[PDB]
Amino acid sequence: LDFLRFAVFVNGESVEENANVVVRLLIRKPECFGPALRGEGGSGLLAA
Amino acid sequence: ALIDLLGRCAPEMHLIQAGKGEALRIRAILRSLVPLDDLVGIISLPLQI
Amino acid sequence: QESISDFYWYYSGKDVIEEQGKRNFSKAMSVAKQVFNSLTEYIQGPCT
Amino acid sequence: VQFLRTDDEVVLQCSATVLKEQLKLCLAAEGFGNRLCFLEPTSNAQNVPPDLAICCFTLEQSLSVRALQEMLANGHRTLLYGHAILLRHAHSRMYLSCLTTSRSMTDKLAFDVGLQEDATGEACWWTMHPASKQ
Amino acid sequence: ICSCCEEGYVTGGHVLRLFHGHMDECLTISAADSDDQRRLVYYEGGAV
């Protein structure tokens, strides 16, 4: 996640193309969000 | 780290004001991804001293 | 063909093609010319 | 030997092996009173015949992704993979769209889909992707 | 749909009037206020 942060945020700005590609791949693979944000469990970030 | 990555993947304020479809779409995707109540709860989360 | 069509749908909203787009069109269209010449040399003659 | 094209009436079919039955269902919405879509089952027809007037969906228009973006910014065309299409309900005469309402209590992330009167937003467009690697 | 539907031909899925007689004799259901609870079928015809 830190590597992706350095990939998508450079020079105090948010790079549009990399941001869009990263969020696209993230929502293609929901398991990357962790157990809290999984659809079926619905654990909730605050509860986690 | 995940929430930070999403926050820095959020579109720029210039894009939001310009109203580009892809910018508003990614912003809405993040808005659905992360809820307001959990965020305000973790902001208000008590910390030991 | 699909890529050139997508390039057209991108530039059709634009009033005037920029020089970068003109160079890309010229390069892709020269490649297309080469492919068309390859096909014509395939079929030239009575190769049923 | 045949391919789906524009202006072809189509029913959206899905399969689910529930209780080892392999029930085949189809998308359907009343449109008036209940714009929300649902799955009515066409697997068991001999015992209970399924209605299809709420299940027919005409392919209004297929288009490429970039051309769709241009149209949003602003001929039996054969459908192909990677193209956004528009589905219009036969009875309801309103287009299938992804509603922002999320009634799913099992998954708060998931959104609902229903019928929208006007095809002005992008939520009414749906792009197919290649299911199998074949 | 098959799309083999012959033009000007009944194909199923089209609601229609049967017209049992020569004309103005279409088969309809029992009356709304009838004691039959709209169960029987009659070739009433006319304004129906």
Curated annotation (Swiss-Prot), chain B:
Distribution of this protein across tissues and organs: Detected in skeletal muscle (at protein level). Fast- or slow-twitch skeletal muscle.
Subcellular location: Sarcoplasmic reticulum membrane
Tree of life domain: Eukaryota
Post-translational modification: The N-terminus is blocked.
Disulfide-bonded cysteines: none
Domain remarks: The calcium release channel activity resides in the C-terminal region while the remaining part of the protein constitutes the 'foot' structure spanning the junctional gap between the sarcoplasmic reticulum (SR) and the T-tubule. Pore opening is mediated via the cytoplasmic calcium-binding domains that mediate a small rotation of the channel-forming transmembrane regions that then leads to channel opening.
Protein family: Belongs to the ryanodine receptor (TC 1.A.3.1) family. RYR1 subfamily.
Note in the entry: Binding of [3H]ryanodine indicates that the heterozygous channel is activated by Ca(2+) concentrations 4-fold lower than normal. Single-cell analysis of cotransfected cells shows a significantly increased resting cytoplasmic Ca(2+) level and a significantly reduced luminal Ca(2+) level.
Assembly and binders: Homotetramer. Can also form heterotetramers with RYR2. Identified in a complex composed of RYR1, PDE4D, PKA, FKBP1A and protein phosphatase 1 (PP1). Repeated very high-level exercise decreases interaction with PDE4D and protein phosphatase 1 (PP1). Interacts with CALM; CALM with bound calcium inhibits the RYR1 channel activity. Interacts with S100A1. Interacts with FKBP1A; this stabilizes the closed conformation of the channel. Interacts with CACNA1S; interaction with CACNA1S is important for activation of the RYR1 channel. Interacts with CACNB1.
Function, as annotated: Cytosolic calcium-activated calcium channel that mediates the release of Ca(2+) from the sarcoplasmic reticulum into the cytosol and thereby plays a key role in triggering muscle contraction following depolarization of T-tubules. Repeated very high-level exercise increases the open probability of the channel and leads to Ca(2+) leaking into the cytoplasm. Can also mediate the release of Ca(2+) from intracellular stores in neurons, and may thereby promote prolonged Ca(2+) signaling in the brain. Required for normal embryonic development of muscle fibers and skeletal muscle.
Listed name of the protein: Ryanodine receptor 1
Species for this entry: Oryctolagus cuniculus (Rabbit)
Residues of the full protein shown: 2428 to 2476 of 5037
Swiss-Prot record, chain C:
Tissue: Detected in skeletal muscle (at protein level). Fast- or slow-twitch skeletal muscle.
Subcellular location field: Sarcoplasmic reticulum membrane
Post-translational modification remark: The N-terminus is blocked. Channel activity is modulated by phosphorylation.
Note: Binding of [3H]ryanodine indicates that the heterozygous channel is activated by Ca(2+) concentrations 4-fold lower than normal. Single-cell analysis of cotransfected cells shows a significantly increased resting cytoplasmic Ca(2+) level and a significantly reduced luminal Ca(2+) level.
Assembly and interaction partners: Homotetramer. Can also form heterotetramers with RYR2. Identified in a complex composed of RYR1, PDE4D, PKA, FKBP1A and protein phosphatase 1 (PP1). Repeated very high-level exercise decreases interaction with PDE4D and protein phosphatase 1 (PP1). Interacts with CALM; CALM with bound calcium inhibits the RYR1 channel activity. Interacts with S100A1. Interacts with FKBP1A; this stabilizes the closed conformation of the channel. Interacts with CACNA1S; interaction with CACNA1S is important for activation of the RYR1 channel. Interacts with CACNB1.
Summary of the function given for this chain in its UniProt record: Cytosolic calcium-activated calcium channel that mediates the release of Ca(2+) from the sarcoplasmic reticulum into the cytosol and thereby plays a key role in triggering muscle contraction following depolarization of T-tubules. Repeated very high-level exercise increases the open probability of the channel and leads to Ca(2+) leaking into the cytoplasm. Can also mediate the release of Ca(2+) from intracellular stores in neurons, and may thereby promote prolonged Ca(2+) signaling in the brain. Required for normal embryonic development of muscle fibers and skeletal muscle.
Domain comment as written in the entry: The calcium release channel activity resides in the C-terminal region while the remaining part of the protein constitutes the 'foot' structure spanning the junctional gap between the sarcoplasmic reticulum (SR) and the T-tubule. Pore opening is mediated via the cytoplasmic calcium-binding domains that mediate a small rotation of the channel-forming transmembrane regions that then leads to channel opening.
Protein's name according to its UniProt entry: Ryanodine receptor 1
Originating species: Oryctolagus cuniculus (Rabbit)
Gene name tied to this protein: RYR1
